[PDB]
Amino acid sequence: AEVRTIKVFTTVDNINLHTQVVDMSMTYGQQFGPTYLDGADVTKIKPHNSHEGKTFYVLPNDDTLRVEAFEYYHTTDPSFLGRYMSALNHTKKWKYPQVNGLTSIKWADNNSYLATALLTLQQIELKFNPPALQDAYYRARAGEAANFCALILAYCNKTVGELGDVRETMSYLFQHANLDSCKRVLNVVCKTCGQQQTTLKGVEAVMYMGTLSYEQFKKGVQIPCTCGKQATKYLVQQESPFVMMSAPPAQYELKHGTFTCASEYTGNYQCGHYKHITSKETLYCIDGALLTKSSEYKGPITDVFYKENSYTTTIK
Ligand SMILES: [Cl-]
Ligand SMILES: [Cl-]
Ligand SMILES: [Zn+2]
């Protein structure tokens, strides 16, 4: 029997290429293990003539690829590249319209949480650490967001179509961002126990769960003390370029000029839809490809983002 071969390249990062000679009588899987062509699983396919010179993603299956994959993605999760490829096979088919000057996502595959996450990132100062996210985010800002959205799904361990939470999604992305300079000082005052200051750094310095209002967080929020009293927690010092205030969805009034952007969630714990609100010359509501405007906004808000640089309390 006549042996036929083609040259292809394998990769884990789509930058560093590895020359391979493949036998056209054997599947990609038999030669490389799980193999993907621009997100499509070709593990059970035999090489085509049209494949010559093309790049295939493989799993990090030797030491060189293990190092290349960690350096690019900053993960050693064995299932990561397969999850990234499985997502990309869908996100490459999504549309990414420019809405009010931002890259959004046309609704598909239950992706509203990703649209509001993507819109938010374009309005806050954030630098990613993994080259994969740096490279994909640059492309997303330019309007080609398929790789970025597939990476969000992979980093968050979410599949296409799965219910997502914006706060959790932002937590994962912030873990892979340089927030090392961010600092928060809180004071908690109990009329029985006295006062306790806490310092938070990095992601914990920019995220708070319990109120949407940055102003209320400065004045004080009531929380339980271990003694059984209500204590007051308030912000003493903030050093960060933004803050994110989150809460269970509740009817909330957004006032033009008092916040950067916000997420709205309509539905229940099992099922629902996110929209994005941005405060510009007026209030714009971006719902995937859809855009409306209003002077006032009230709805079931879950996350609000605010601009910051340096804040020090006047509370003694
Ligand atoms: Cl590679
Ligand atoms: Cl970046
Ligand atoms: Zn107490």
Curated annotation (Swiss-Prot):
Q: Where is each Ubiquitin-like domain found?
A: 3-58
Q: What is the effect of changing residue 146 to D?
A: In strain: Alpha/B.1.1.7
Its topology with respect to the membrane?
Multi-pass membrane protein
Location in the cell reads: Host endoplasmic reticulum membrane
Domain Peptidase C16: start-end pairs: 72-316
Write down the superkingdom of origin: Viruses
Known consequence of changing residue 5 to I?
A: In strain: Kappa/B.1.617.1
Q: What is the effect of changing residue 76 to A?
A: Partial loss of ubiquitin cleavage in vitro; no effect on ISG15 cleavage in vitro
Q: Where is the active site?
A: 112 (for pl-pro activity), 273 (for pl-pro activity), 287 (for pl-pro activity)
Q: Which reaction does it catalyse?
A: Thiol-dependent hydrolysis of ester, thioester, amide, peptide and isopeptide bonds formed by the C-terminal Gly of ubiquitin (a 76-residue protein attached to proteins as an intracellular targeting signal)
Mutating residue 67 to A leads to what result? Partial loss of ISG15 cleavage in vitro
LRR repeat locations: 118-140
Q: Where are the zinc fingers (C4-type)?
A: 190-227
Which amino acids does the record list as binding Zn(2+) 6?
A: 190, 193, 225, 227
- What does the subunit section of this Swiss-Prot or TrEMBL entry state? May form homohexamers. Interacts with N protein.
Role summary: Responsible for the cleavages located at the N-terminus of the replicase polyprotein. Participates together with nsp4 in the assembly of virally-induced cytoplasmic double-membrane vesicles necessary for viral replication. Antagonizes innate immune induction of type I interferon by blocking the phosphorylation, dimerization and subsequent nuclear translocation of host IRF3. Also prevents host NF-kappa-B signaling. In addition, PL-PRO possesses a deubiquitinating/deISGylating activity and processes both 'Lys-48'- and 'Lys-63'-linked polyubiquitin chains from cellular substrates.
User: What is the name of the protein in this document?
Assistant: Papain-like protease nsp3
Taxonomic source organism: Severe acute respiratory syndrome coronavirus 2 (2019-nCoV)
